Design a protein around this motif. Structure first.
Motif, PDB file in Angstrom:
ATOM      1  N   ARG A 188       0.826  -1.198   0.000  1.00  0.00           N
ATOM      2  CA  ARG A 188       0.000   0.000   0.000  1.00  0.00           C
ATOM      3  C   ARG A 188       0.864   1.252   0.000  1.00  0.00           C
ATOM      4  O   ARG A 188       1.909   1.299   0.653  1.00  0.00           O
ATOM      5  N   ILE A 189       0.409   2.265  -0.729  1.00  0.00           N
ATOM      6  CA  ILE A 189       1.037   3.581  -0.734  1.00  0.00           C
ATOM      7  C   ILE A 189       0.467   4.362   0.442  1.00  0.00           C
ATOM      8  O   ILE A 189      -0.704   4.743   0.432  1.00  0.00           O
ATOM      9  N   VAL A 190       1.290   4.606   1.459  1.00  0.00           N
ATOM     10  CA  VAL A 190       0.799   5.271   2.664  1.00  0.00           C
ATOM     11  C   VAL A 190       0.702   6.776   2.445  1.00  0.00           C
ATOM     12  O   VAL A 190      -0.384   7.360   2.504  1.00  0.00           O
ATOM     13  N   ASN A 191       1.829   7.426   2.177  1.00  0.00           N
ATOM     14  CA  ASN A 191       1.789   8.855   1.919  1.00  0.00           C
ATOM     15  C   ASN A 191       1.235   9.116   0.520  1.00  0.00           C
ATOM     16  O   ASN A 191       1.269   8.256  -0.359  1.00  0.00           O
ATOM     17  N   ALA A 192       0.703  10.318   0.322  1.00  0.00           N
ATOM     18  CA  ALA A 192       0.061  10.693  -0.929  1.00  0.00           C
ATOM     19  C   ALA A 192       0.945  11.667  -1.695  1.00  0.00           C
ATOM     20  O   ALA A 192       1.493  12.605  -1.111  1.00  0.00           O
ATOM     21  N   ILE A 193       1.068  11.454  -3.006  1.00  0.00           N
ATOM     22  CA  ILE A 193       1.951  12.248  -3.855  1.00  0.00           C
ATOM     23  C   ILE A 193       1.319  12.408  -5.232  1.00  0.00           C
ATOM     24  O   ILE A 193       0.290  11.807  -5.550  1.00  0.00           O
ATOM     25  N   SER A 194       1.962  13.229  -6.058  1.00  0.00           N
ATOM     26  CA  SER A 194       1.550  13.472  -7.431  1.00  0.00           C
ATOM     27  C   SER A 194       2.754  13.296  -8.344  1.00  0.00           C
ATOM     28  O   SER A 194       3.820  13.860  -8.081  1.00  0.00           O
ATOM     29  N   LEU A 195       2.584  12.511  -9.405  1.00  0.00           N
ATOM     30  CA  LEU A 195       3.609  12.337 -10.423  1.00  0.00           C
ATOM     31  C   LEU A 195       3.179  13.071 -11.682  1.00  0.00           C
ATOM     32  O   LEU A 195       2.085  12.802 -12.200  1.00  0.00           O
ATOM     33  N   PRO A 196       3.986  13.988 -12.205  1.00  0.00           N
ATOM     34  CA  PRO A 196       3.604  14.693 -13.432  1.00  0.00           C
ATOM     35  C   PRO A 196       3.710  13.778 -14.642  1.00  0.00           C
ATOM     36  O   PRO A 196       4.207  12.652 -14.572  1.00  0.00           O
ATOM     37  N   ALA A 197       3.208  14.281 -15.768  1.00  0.00           N
ATOM     38  CA  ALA A 197       3.269  13.530 -17.013  1.00  0.00           C
ATOM     39  C   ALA A 197       4.716  13.334 -17.447  1.00  0.00           C
ATOM     40  O   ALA A 197       5.560  14.216 -17.272  1.00  0.00           O
ATOM     41  N   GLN A 198       4.999  12.164 -18.011  1.00  0.00           N
ATOM     42  CA  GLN A 198       6.352  11.798 -18.399  1.00  0.00           C
ATOM     43  C   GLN A 198       6.323  11.120 -19.759  1.00  0.00           C
ATOM     44  O   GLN A 198       5.272  10.692 -20.242  1.00  0.00           O
ATOM     45  N   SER A 199       7.497  11.033 -20.376  1.00  0.00           N
ATOM     46  CA  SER A 199       7.679  10.338 -21.640  1.00  0.00           C
ATOM     47  C   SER A 199       8.790   9.309 -21.481  1.00  0.00           C
ATOM     48  O   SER A 199       9.408   9.192 -20.421  1.00  0.00           O
ATOM     49  N   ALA A 200       9.024   8.545 -22.551  1.00  0.00           N
ATOM     50  CA  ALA A 200      10.078   7.536 -22.526  1.00  0.00           C
ATOM     51  C   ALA A 200      11.452   8.171 -22.360  1.00  0.00           C
ATOM     52  O   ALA A 200      12.304   7.649 -21.632  1.00  0.00           O
ATOM     53  N   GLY A 201      11.690   9.296 -23.036  1.00  0.00           N
ATOM     54  CA  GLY A 201      12.977   9.961 -22.916  1.00  0.00           C
ATOM     55  C   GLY A 201      13.147  10.668 -21.584  1.00  0.00           C
ATOM     56  O   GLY A 201      14.161  10.496 -20.901  1.00  0.00           O
ATOM     57  N   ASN A 202      12.124  11.431 -21.184  1.00  0.00           N
ATOM     58  CA  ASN A 202      12.173  12.157 -19.886  1.00  0.00           C
ATOM     59  C   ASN A 202      12.178  11.147 -18.733  1.00  0.00           C
ATOM     60  O   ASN A 202      13.182  11.110 -17.994  1.00  0.00           O
ATOM     61  N   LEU A 203      11.094  10.379 -18.582  1.00  0.00           N
ATOM     62  CA  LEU A 203      10.990   9.373 -17.489  1.00  0.00           C
ATOM     63  C   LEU A 203      11.276  10.053 -16.144  1.00  0.00           C
ATOM     64  O   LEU A 203      12.261   9.666 -15.487  1.00  0.00           O
ATOM     65  N   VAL A 204      10.436  11.018 -15.753  1.00  0.00           N
ATOM     66  CA  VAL A 204      10.659  11.767 -14.479  1.00  0.00           C
ATOM     67  C   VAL A 204      10.724  10.769 -13.317  1.00  0.00           C
ATOM     68  O   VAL A 204       9.812   9.925 -13.208  1.00  0.00           O
ATOM     69  N   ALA A 205      11.770  10.859 -12.492  1.00  0.00           N
ATOM     70  CA  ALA A 205      11.907   9.970 -11.350  1.00  0.00           C
ATOM     71  C   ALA A 205      10.785  10.269 -10.372  1.00  0.00           C
ATOM     72  O   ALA A 205      10.727  11.369  -9.814  1.00  0.00           O
ATOM     73  N   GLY A 206       9.871   9.317 -10.205  1.00  0.00           N
ATOM     74  CA  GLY A 206       8.761   9.529  -9.294  1.00  0.00           C
ATOM     75  C   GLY A 206       9.255   9.777  -7.882  1.00  0.00           C
ATOM     76  O   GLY A 206      10.215   9.156  -7.421  1.00  0.00           O
ATOM     77  N   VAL A 207       8.607  10.729  -7.208  1.00  0.00           N
ATOM     78  CA  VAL A 207       9.061  11.155  -5.894  1.00  0.00           C
ATOM     79  C   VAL A 207       8.974   9.986  -4.916  1.00  0.00           C
ATOM     80  O   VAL A 207       8.059   9.156  -4.984  1.00  0.00           O
ATOM     81  N   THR A 208       9.958   9.904  -4.022  1.00  0.00           N
ATOM     82  CA  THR A 208      10.021   8.806  -3.071  1.00  0.00           C
ATOM     83  C   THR A 208       8.811   8.837  -2.148  1.00  0.00           C
ATOM     84  O   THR A 208       8.276   9.900  -1.822  1.00  0.00           O
ATOM     85  N   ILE A 209       8.365   7.652  -1.739  1.00  0.00           N
ATOM     86  CA  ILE A 209       7.089   7.513  -1.055  1.00  0.00           C
ATOM     87  C   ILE A 209       7.217   6.531   0.102  1.00  0.00           C
ATOM     88  O   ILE A 209       7.998   5.576   0.054  1.00  0.00           O
ATOM     89  N   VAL A 210       6.471   6.799   1.168  1.00  0.00           N
ATOM     90  CA  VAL A 210       6.317   5.833   2.248  1.00  0.00           C
ATOM     91  C   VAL A 210       5.329   4.769   1.797  1.00  0.00           C
ATOM     92  O   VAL A 210       4.241   5.083   1.302  1.00  0.00           O
ATOM     93  N   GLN A 211       5.708   3.507   1.952  1.00  0.00           N
ATOM     94  CA  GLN A 211       4.858   2.395   1.569  1.00  0.00           C
ATOM     95  C   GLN A 211       4.801   1.386   2.706  1.00  0.00           C
ATOM     96  O   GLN A 211       5.746   1.247   3.489  1.00  0.00           O
ATOM     97  N   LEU A 212       3.659   0.717   2.811  1.00  0.00           N
ATOM     98  CA  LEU A 212       3.447  -0.347   3.781  1.00  0.00           C
ATOM     99  C   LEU A 212       3.317  -1.650   3.010  1.00  0.00           C
ATOM    100  O   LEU A 212       2.469  -1.765   2.119  1.00  0.00           O
ATOM    101  N   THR A 213       4.157  -2.621   3.345  1.00  0.00           N
ATOM    102  CA  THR A 213       4.179  -3.907   2.667  1.00  0.00           C
ATOM    103  C   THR A 213       3.715  -4.976   3.645  1.00  0.00           C
ATOM    104  O   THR A 213       4.251  -5.076   4.752  1.00  0.00           O
ATOM    105  N   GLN A 214       2.714  -5.754   3.234  1.00  0.00           N
ATOM    106  CA  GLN A 214       2.075  -6.782   4.062  1.00  0.00           C
ATOM    107  C   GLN A 214       1.643  -6.266   5.431  1.00  0.00           C
ATOM    108  O   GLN A 214       0.866  -5.319   5.529  1.00  0.00           O
TER     109      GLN A 214
END
Lengths: 211, 54
Positions: free
Chosen positions: A185-211
């Protein structure tokens, strides 16, 4: 090299690290090599820290003859294996080797055949997540996580995502070819802007809960 | 003591293999198992009958 700027607050954490303390499960493993991967192994990755690795056999036995000493229960994992082993983490465990002569150059890549700590589950883990499409995305509290496999076909991986890159999708929207980490699960909430194959914006780091 | 039924001997098998160290990794655990070995006592008998004329 040093702070070229000043933000109103510190970042909550760095990718691969633990923010929240609680029930956690992690296992050690050896990084293997995408070259050693018997099948095509399309997806290519540099053993980055915030990546989800996959099991690829065992290296418990030692020796070259019939009597082999099983010294330890050692797991032999690869960056994008379909059998999800754990998200690599805890960068403070490892030693910096530099990059291309500069021994003090920054590096988040573990060398091949090294040992890593792969969190199978954690209350809070900072992970780099990516976009599974070329459009802008919004991740909230109720959002799931799926990582890119090693054998993701070129048609599915149009954006050229890295080998073990964790994506982050919405219920019933898993980018094709991607395999899901169960109960992630994605715990914290974020926004990823539009990206392309060449750009490929590094998605902002996120707090996640696993199992 | 010729009336006992069995003689018992204990054997214990330890268990546990090491694992590579990690700060946040799970702690592997050792353990053991115990079995008991029984040998039954067999009583044999033999007799005689003797007569006067014999």
């Amino acid at each position: 090299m040093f702070q070229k700027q000043v933000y109103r607050q510190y970042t909550p954490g760095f990718p691969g690290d633990l923010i929240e303390d609680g029930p956690k499960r992690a296992r050690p493993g050896r990084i293997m090599s995408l070259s050693a991967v018997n099948p095509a192994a399309t997806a290519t990755g540099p053993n980055r820290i915030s990546r989800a690795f996959g099991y690829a056999g065992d290296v418990s036995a030692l020796g070259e003859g019939q009597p082999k000493t099983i010294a330890a229960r050692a797991s032999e994992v690869v960056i994008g294996g379909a059998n999800f082993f754990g998200v690599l983490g805890h960068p403070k465990h490892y030693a910096l080797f530099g990059s291309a002569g500069d021994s003090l150059a920054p590096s988040y890549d573990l060398p091949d055949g090294a040992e890593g700590e792969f969190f199978d589950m954690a209350t809070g883990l900072v992970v780099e997540i990516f976009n599974g499409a070329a459009t802008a995305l919004d991740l909230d509290y109720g959002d799931l996580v799926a990582y890119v496999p090693n054998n993701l076909p070129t048609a599915d991986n149009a954006l050229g995502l890295p080998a073990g890159a964790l994506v982050g999708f919405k219920a019933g929207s898993m980018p094709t070819g991607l395999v899901q980490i169960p109960n992630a699960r994605i715990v914290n909430a974020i926004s990823l802007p539009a990206q392309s194959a060449g750009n490929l914006v590094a998605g902002v780091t996120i707090v996640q809960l696993t199992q | 003591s010729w009336e006992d039924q069995e003689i018992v001997q204990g054997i214990v098998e330890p268990a546990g293999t090491a694992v590579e160290y990690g700060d946040h990794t799970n702690i592997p655990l050792t353990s053991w198992n115990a079995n008991f070995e029984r040998r039954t006592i067999v009583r044999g008998e033999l007799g005689m009958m003797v007569g006067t004329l014999e």
